[PDB]
């Protein structure tokens, strides 16, 4: 196997090592030989691997590689037939073969394969567990939408589960319900002698409601609420619903609502609505009990509040009472309340409720002008001095910084929030504008190691969840894995590592991530999933059109194509076609449209075979536009806008790639492009982008709404702009 790892890493000693090893021999080495051919040329390799398939390999490693090879060539027929032929030929190894098949198949969420594996495993299987697998896999398939197979899939799963009666636990019962109507679910769950879990209780109540079984549901919910201390709002609503349906009076229901709990106080509103009565008194009663609670507004504002209740906006001592009242009247001018409660009090790790009001005031004031952004940066930092763990203020502070060339200053906030593991997948994008430093590069690699860790942990979770019976949770493990496999946050992480690696001269990381791209081309070219969190900084606020972190999802894909093409050794034309289709529909700024046209012409000239006239046309466009007089359009008219360092960072990376290709593919026209980029650093420095930004900042006047020091922030922002911009200019 050691010789095989050298072959993978590549490339001439590989064919010799296999020529020697195979000359000693057996099917494995021939599979290797024909992979090495595929690494040289492929039409032979498929014929040769097809030749191997028919010899019925009978060895697990050789089967795995074959099925891997055929799947790599979009030959799903053959990738499955290797295992099926082995199971057919050697049915005593059915379990072992099927589990290897399954463990290797998980990454590729082909529920037809899962169900096919489970079919073989259940035929040569004396296993209740395996029957459950097979049955559950029919539900998985049903979640894909070949509606013409749906009736069959549902009938096969139902009948497999019926074969396992009597049921031994709530997981098996759950699986059965996946193939049942609402009518059947009620009938089944009403006869279960085992105690139901929460999952099945909720399913039982939903079924009764759908069947209009309002006697059975009123009785059932009443049991949960009045005898089993559940105290569940959704269950309370079903209880009053079914109560009315079976003819109970309003008074009959309300007389049982004696405890002044939160859920019952809200329910009284829900009960007025249900009986076409007036909302007012029960809204007032909830407010009197809960106005000192931060929940009050969110609980009431979901109803249509009478204008009389809101009219009590006249003239308080309890801070949270004031917070709710200011929310009810949607008042955005709240510094007066801040001045009365600026001091953090209570538990040290609690946020100060005043900053629910101040954040609303700050968000309403945001107008995207750089003076307004800097002013509100000063206010956020000031609030965070006393309210040190308020995450919403922290997230917004990063968003504001993301509007400027202060790329230095976001990572300390992100890391002070102790983002780790899955939070990187959802919050990553806050680091979009961070500067290409070595410390940031190492942080990004650390983020990538989370991705490596999560990939292996969720795979094992899926294996253990199947081995244990936990069908209640399995679909969520599988979907979690799927959503993580090719997310925009993962690909941004790789794109960002590559960019900083090439801007700095650090080739240590570059070779690992180039190898990821060539390994996962099919994903790089596919559509990415999006699990980013654009909501948490709005929790308890109404989301409005405000400033955004400046993500660019199409550029992320194109960056990965760029690197994939640069390091393509056989045929780049397929990747350039994807590149050109994407740029044709890309939705870019003027500069980004030019950048990726420049990239496209650069890669076509260096990585494809062109006649001399095609070469000259593509190269002439690079020659005319690799000039500061053309590239100045990367400079925004608002010099303080973060787009300046974003575009400049991309220009620097593009020039590094020009130089890389000039080495790997020397030509007179590449040496001329290397020559053309030489004066960029001098020419961009002479534009004095730092000084002009410092002058605009010093000319800005500030009338902050509270007592703050602007000075310390102006200096930190000017120094950060300088450090980040000068690092880029010296890198041209």
């Amino acid at each position: 196997e050691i010789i095989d790892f050298i072959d993978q890493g590549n490339t001439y000693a590989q064919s010799l090592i296999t020529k020697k090893l195979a000359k000693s021999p057996l099917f494995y080495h021939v599979l290797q030989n024909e992979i090495h051919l595929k690494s040289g040329q492929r039409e032979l390799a498929i014929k040769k691997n097809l030749e191997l398939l028919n010899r019925y390999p009978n060895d697990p490693l050789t089967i795995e590689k074959l099925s891997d090879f055929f799947s790599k060539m979009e030959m799903e027929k053959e990738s499955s037939l290797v295992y099926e032929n082995a199971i057919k030929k050697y049915p005593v190894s059915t379990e072992t073969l099927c589990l290897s098949w399954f463990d290797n198949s998980i990454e590729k969420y082909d529920f037809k394969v899962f169900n096919r594996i489970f079919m073989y495993l259940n035929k040569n299987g004396k296993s209740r567990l395996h029957t459950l697998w097979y049955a559950f896999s029919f539900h998985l398939l049903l979640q894909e939408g070949e509606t013409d197979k749906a009736s069959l899939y549902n009938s096969l799963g139902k009948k497999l589960m019926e074969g396992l009666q009597p049921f031994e636990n709530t997981q098996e019962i759950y699986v059965y319900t996946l193939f049942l109507s609402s009518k059947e679910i009620e009938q089944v769950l009403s006869g279960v002698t085992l105690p139901l879990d929460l999952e099945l209780k909720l399913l039982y109540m939903k079924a009764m409601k759908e069947n209009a079984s309002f006697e059975a549901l009123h009785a059932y919910t009443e049991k949960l609420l009045f005898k089993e201390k559940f105290d569940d709002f959704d269950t309370w609503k079903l209880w009053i619903l079914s109560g009315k349906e079976i003819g109970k009076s309003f008074e009959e229901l309300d007389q049982k609502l004696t405890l002044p709990t939160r859920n019952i106080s809200l329910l009284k509103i829900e009960l007025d609505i249900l009986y076409s009565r007036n909302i007012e008194t029960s809204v007032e009663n909830y407010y009197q009990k809960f106005n000192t609670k931060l929940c009050c507004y969110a609980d009431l504002s979901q109803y249509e509040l009478p204008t009389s209740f809101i009219g009590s906006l006249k003239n308080e001592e309890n801070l949270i009472t004031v917070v709710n009242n200011r929310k009810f009247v949607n008042q955005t001018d709240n510094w007066d309340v801040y001045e009365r409660f600026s001091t953090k009090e209570g538990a040290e790790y609690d946020s100060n409720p005043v900053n629910e009001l101040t954040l609303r005031t700050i968000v309403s004031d945001l107008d995207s002008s750089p003076q307004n952004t800097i002013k509100n940066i000063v206010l956020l930092k000031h609030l965070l001095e006393q309210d040190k763990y308020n995450y919403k203020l922290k997230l917004w502070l990063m968003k504001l910084y993301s509007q400027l060339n202060t790329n230095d200053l976001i990572f300390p906030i992100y890391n002070g929030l102790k983002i780790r593991m899955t939070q990187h997948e959802t919050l990553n994008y806050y680091l979009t504008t961070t500067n290409p430093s070595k410390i940031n590069l190492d942080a990004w690699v650390d983020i990538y190691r989370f991705y490596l860790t999560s990939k292996q942990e969720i795979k094992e979770s899926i294996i253990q969840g199947f081995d244990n019976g936990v069908f209640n949770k399995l679909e969520g493990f599988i979907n979690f894995s799927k959503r993580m496999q090719n997310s925009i946050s993962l690909n941004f992480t790789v794109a960002k590592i590559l960019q900083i690696s090439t801007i700095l001269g650090t080739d240590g990381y570059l070779n690992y991530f180039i190898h990821y791209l060539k390994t996962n081309e099919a994903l790089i070219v596919s559509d990415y999933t999006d699990n980013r969190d654009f909501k948490s900084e709005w929790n308890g606020l109404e989301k409005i059109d405000c400033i955004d972190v400046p993500v660019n999802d199409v550029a992320t894909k194109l960056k990965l194509l760029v690197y994939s093409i640069v390091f393509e050794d056989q045929d780049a034309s397929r990747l350039l076609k994807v590149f050109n289709k994407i740029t044709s529909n890309a939705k870019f700024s003027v500069f980004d449209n030019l950048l990726y046209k420049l990239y496209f012409n650069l890669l076509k000239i260096t990585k494809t075979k062109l006649n001399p006239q095609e070469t000259q046309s593509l190269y002439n466009y690079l020659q005319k536009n690799l000039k500061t007089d053309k590239l100045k359009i990367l400079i925004p008219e608002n010099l303080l806008s973060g787009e300046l360092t974003q575009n400049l960072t991309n220009l620097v990376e593009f020039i590094k790639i020009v130089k890389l290709l000039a080495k790997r593919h020397p030509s007179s026209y590449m040496n001329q492009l290397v020559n053309l980029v030489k004066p960029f650093g001098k020419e961009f420095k002479n534009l004095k982008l730092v000084q002009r930004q410092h002058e605009i900042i010093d000319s800005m006047d500030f009338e902050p709404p509270i007592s703050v020091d602007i000075s310390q922030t102006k200096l930190e922002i000017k120094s950060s702009i300088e450090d980040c911009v000068v690092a880029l200019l010296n890198s041209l």
């Binding site: 105690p195 879990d197 929460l198 999952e199 909720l202 201390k229 559940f230 105290d231 569940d232 709002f233 959704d234 269950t235 939160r262 859920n263 809200l266 809960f290 609670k293 931060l294 929940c295 969110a298 609980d299 979901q302 538990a347 790790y349 609690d350 946020s351 763990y389 995450y391 929030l417 102790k418 983002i419 780790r420 593991m421 899955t422 939070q423 997948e425 959802t426 919050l427 860790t453 999560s454 942990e457 969720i458 094992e460 979770s461 253990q464 969840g465 244990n468 936990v470 209640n472 949770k473 969520g476 493990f477 979907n479 979690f480 959503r483 969190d533 909501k535 948490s536 929790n539 308890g540």
Partner: protein, 153 residues
């Protein structure tokens, strides 16, 4: 509040809770382990009107001498908007309704010795300090803790 079973994909929508500075965000494997081994003891609170998670409970059962079992609370947290209305107390009390928990002898938990807040919370729920224990990212785990117990019927 309503209570719902926790599912893995809830992890993607938990930042309002898990960005709290005392609320750890664990590895995928740790969350999934609780869902695999004690799936009923990992549930979430949810609020009207959008079904947003207002908090969650992660608990487990654990065997000793293993002729004698107990339940253990590993994590309770409540979103800031829904604090001081007994939601944490409700999540802890709901354990006592689960038959898997009722079949154990007691519920225990660890509170840091400096967390006078948490001790009182659990004391109000019927827990009492049983024993001080040694300790050894967001929380310094080297700080001593109180194991607190509540005997079950």
């Amino acid at each position: 509040t309503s209570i719902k079973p926790f599912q893995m994909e809830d992890l993607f929508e938990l930042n309002p809770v898990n960005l709290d500075p005392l609320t750890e965000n664990f590895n995928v494997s740790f969350y999934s382990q609780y869902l695999i081994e004690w799936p009923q003891l990992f549930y979430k609170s949810v609020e009207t009107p959008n079904g947003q998670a207002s908090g969650y409970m992660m608990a487990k059962t654990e065997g000793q001498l293993k002729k004698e079992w107990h339940t253990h609370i590993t994590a309770v947290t409540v979103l800031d908007q829904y604090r001081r209305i007994g939601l944490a107390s409700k999540l802890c009390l709901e354990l006592e309704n689960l038959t898997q928990v009722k079949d154990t002898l007691f519920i225990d938990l660890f509170v840091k010795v400096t967390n006078t807040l948490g001790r009182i919370l659990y004391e109000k729920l019927g827990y009492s300090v049983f024993r001080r224990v040694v300790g050894y990212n967001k929380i310094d785990d080297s700080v001593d803790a109180f194991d607190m117990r509540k005997l079950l019927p």
